[PDB]
Amino acid sequence: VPNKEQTRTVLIFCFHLKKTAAESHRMLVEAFGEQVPTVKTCERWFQRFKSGDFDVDDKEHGKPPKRYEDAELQALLDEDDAQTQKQLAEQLEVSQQAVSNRLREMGKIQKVGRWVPHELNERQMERRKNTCEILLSRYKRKSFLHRIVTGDEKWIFFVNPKRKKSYVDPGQPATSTARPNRFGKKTMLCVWWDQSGVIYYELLKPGETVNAARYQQQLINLNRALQRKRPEYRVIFLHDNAPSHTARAVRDTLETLNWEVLPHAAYSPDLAPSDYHLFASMGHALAEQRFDSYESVKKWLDEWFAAKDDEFYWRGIHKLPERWEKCVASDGKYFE
Amino acid sequence: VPNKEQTRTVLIFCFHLKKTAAESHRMLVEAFGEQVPTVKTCERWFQRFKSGDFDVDDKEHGKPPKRYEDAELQALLDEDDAQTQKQLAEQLEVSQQAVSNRLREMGKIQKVGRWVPHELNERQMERRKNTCEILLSRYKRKSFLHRIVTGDEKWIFFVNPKRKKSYVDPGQPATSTARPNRFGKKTMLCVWWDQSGVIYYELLKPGETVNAARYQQQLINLNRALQRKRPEYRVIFLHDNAPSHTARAVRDTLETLNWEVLPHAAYSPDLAPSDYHLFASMGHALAEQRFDSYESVKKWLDEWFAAKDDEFYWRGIHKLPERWEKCVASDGKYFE
DNA sequence: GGTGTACAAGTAGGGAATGTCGGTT
DNA sequence: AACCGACATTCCCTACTTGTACACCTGG
DNA sequence: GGTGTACAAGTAGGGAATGTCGGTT
DNA sequence: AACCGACATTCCCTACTTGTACACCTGG
DNA sequence: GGTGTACAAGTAGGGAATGTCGGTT
DNA sequence: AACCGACATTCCCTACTTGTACACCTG
Ligand SMILES: [Mn+2]
Ligand SMILES: [Mn+2]
């Protein structure tokens, strides 16, 4: 009856009764019948038993040689880590299924890259690196974030649907969503805030623009609202290089307010707290959220800003230095 | 130095040597030592040996109870098959991790749903059903497909990048891509085709628009090219309800050419061979493609439309029949 | 409309695990 | 009888293969 | 910033697997 | 001695738990 | 975002309708 | 008073323009 495993047990038991090899074998036929391993394989078990080898496991078997080294497929990734299996395959003379396996066998996983706002010129980066160095230099001499009042502009549609993920048996349809229309109803939000909260915001009506003209009016209203909400206020103002924000007219509206405008490189939303922090948070919050009327957008926004904590804003602003640092370490290339 | 499995082999060995249960135990202690099991076990083993049962492995142990039933979790999916695990867990009173497991244990996988072009109206679904019904009723009677000349219009940006997928160790990042610009240079393409190939295409200059005026012009230009390339043509025209396609003026330009316009319910790009099949194949081929010159866009298209085997277009058109059935059986809801 | 990844199942080798057998004591 | 060495036979485990399912793309 | 899934590791508890022991022959 | 039945003790295997990593999101 | 059709409302124009004026008995 | 033709206005009624909905195709 017994298998190589059950057999070796016996031969250990037979070993421990001082039975000789050939003796044990006789007992096996006596016990189980003719169909028991040959004497030769008893003599063998015995020969290793005498060494303290009662190790049950077969010694490691034979294996077809790997038709390509690990470090070989690894060094292909070292040139272009974003190739398909089929592409790697035809460089290693194996199938894709083969390249499927060895990538699973090595620690490797497949992950999808980041979208970055803009392709940056050899120069575009230099400007970033500079600004970031400049601000850090200042940051070390004296913390000044406590003086920062930034703000920016962000669309808010009346419907924000996301593609839905369904848990269902294989080869079945996942509940589907209807596209967000590119030319749907939307209202521009313009919001200004500081490390202690949101100072002032305007929610523009559907078709409304922001021009050198209106921008002025706004930061004068901001000023008015600043006077009451921030009594202690000099003051530092951070905003991106909108065609509207660099307006000859507006530049002067800032001088005549005695506001210091922190330098800001273009295509750098990763350095604008309004974008990388405030809005980013709102992005999550707006998911699948509907707005029937312009009134409710303002009501949601109102309760949304209000129901934030204090630290939330504080944290947004104080992550600047960390970003300026990366912004330099990454040498101007996006760092996010 | 035996285990709760190895000793059982031995007890089988002794059973088949006509040794008494207690006798065998005395042999166990003699051979191995003092850490063998009791005689009480040997007696028990023997008692099941005396039957024909020499099955080594245990009986199934005591296991905790299931806190909810597989089919009870199934009722939640029947309601809403797209729910986060956390949400299911709450309804079941178990943890998320708990549900992560029972979904693994059941057949269930996670799938991303579709983007359907437009949210359809109780009415718009009927329009679709009918039109599909009508055309199919006819196709059954007499195949009118080889007479179908159809066309549409589709943008083509000068840079078509895709997020890149990388094979990498966990934690390490994947190569990032610069985002496609919504406002980049983009030439419009107006193309008309037929079961045997493309008849006449018109690649517009950047700014160029299509109005009641220009559409007519093209329809005539089409006809001329149709006379020499398709020397046999009466023509059936298929085109979507673009405001330009549905102008008073144009319907008359179509009459003057004597073309049967097939009815085509609004919001039905899934029934326009131009979109659902020709541009579809294009979207793939256009991936990661850069176009520096307007000439190359034409040079690309020329060589592309050309190298396309004749059947390709044939299949495109002949897939209408099944889309109609499918459009019909699904009562007008989208069906892709 | 195309394409990319992984589960199936089959297959060839590389040796171990085993057997055979003539040689020793 | 007992055990051995050497060459032959059997078996086991893996790195591949082709075949295939299928998630997700793609045009709106 | 925010959140959704799964790999770790620990824990209870339900019985089997095993032990203990005085009762039979 | 041998084996038993009955009650006690130990051990094994799982369905959960909490803790945590981390892909991917989110603003541009 | 582009674009066309369908009325709903808002200006002009050739007609009217009415007004002014000369004439004659 | 009576009455005309000859023009000049005060208006309409229709008639060309705008103005203000929608409707349909792209991502
Ligand atoms: Mn901005
Ligand atoms: Mn179209």
Residue numbers in the entry:
A (entry chain A), B (entry chain B): 5 to 237, 243 to 345
Provide the authors' own sentences about this structure as they appear in the paper.
The well characterized mariner transposon Mos1, found in Drosophila mauritiana, has 28-bp inverted repeats that differ by 4 bp.
Crystals of the Mos1 IRL PEC were formed by mixing full-length Mos1 transposase (T216A mutant) with duplex IRL DNA. This had a 3-nt overhang at the 3′ end of the transferred strand, mimicking the product of staggered transposon excision. The Mos1 IRL PEC structure has a similar overall architecture to the Mos1 IRR PEC described previously and comprises a transposase dimer bound to two IRL DNA molecules in a crossed configuration; one IRL DNA is bound by the DNA-binding domain of one monomer and the catalytic domain of the other monomer, and vice versa. As before, two additional IRL DNA duplexes interact with the catalytic domains, possibly occupying the binding sites of target DNA. Moreover, the pyrimidine-specific interaction between T16 O2 and the backbone amide of Lys-67 in the IRR PEC is lost in the IRL PEC because T16 is replaced by G in the IRL sequence. Additionally, the O2 of C41 (base-paired with G16) repels the backbone carbonyl of Lys-67 in the PEC IRL structure. Surprisingly, in the IRL PEC structure, there are additional interactions between the N1H and NH2 of G56 and the side-chain carboxylates of Glu-345, the C-terminal transposase residue.
